[PDB]
């Protein structure tokens, strides 16, 4: 029903997740109803073979903070059929975050949420700190972006 969901192609596709980021990476599979399911995490510099399927949908996040990451320099990864038995590479990297978002990342990592409002900063930043990264907001944005085109 949702635009962004895995399709039950039942066509096997071998994939290699390669973490070329400095974060611990959480692979997230969008199931057939478009709901996120987590898979075991990947340390920096590590690669791992996965048995996935043509037309399944993946995204990749910081396992601890849920910051969004890039896969093959984009947001969503979709396996195709292997050619020559060669696995398909999903190379995970850091996006160029805005300076604001990167600062929010660092502050969030050092301040408990119940203490955001104890910080002596401009008031509008409180909501900014509290609007944590998360898969559902990104999927909304990507869905509208897929409609547009």
């Amino acid at each position: 029903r949702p635009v962004l969901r895995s399709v039950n192609s039942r066509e096997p596709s071998q994939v290699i997740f390669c973490n070329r980021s400095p974060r611990v990476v959480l692979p997230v599979w969008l199931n057939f109803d478009g709901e996120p399911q987590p898979y075991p995490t990947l340390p920096p510099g590590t690669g791992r073979r996965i048995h996935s399927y043509r037309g399944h949908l993946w995204l990749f996040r910081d396992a601890g903070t849920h910051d969004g990451l890039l896969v093959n320099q984009t947001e969503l990864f979709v396996p195709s059929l292997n050619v020559d038995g060669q696995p398909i590479f999903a190379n995970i990297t850091l996006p160029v975050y805005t300076l604001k978002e990167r600062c929010l990342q660092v502050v969030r990592s050092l301040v408990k949420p119940e203490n955001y409002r104890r910080l002596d900063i401009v008031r509008s930043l409180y909501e900014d700190l509290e609007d944590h990264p998360n898969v559902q907001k990104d999927l909304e944005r990507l869905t509208q972006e897929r409609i547009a085109h």
Binding site: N8, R10, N31, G47, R48, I50, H51, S52, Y53
Partner: peptide, 17 residues
């Protein structure tokens, strides 16, 4: 038909990439 979800092979091991 039955649904088939992604799975990690039992004989897979991690490597440096």
């Amino acid at each position: 038909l039955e649904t088939l979800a992604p799975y990690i092979p039992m004989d897979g091991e991690d490597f440096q990439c």
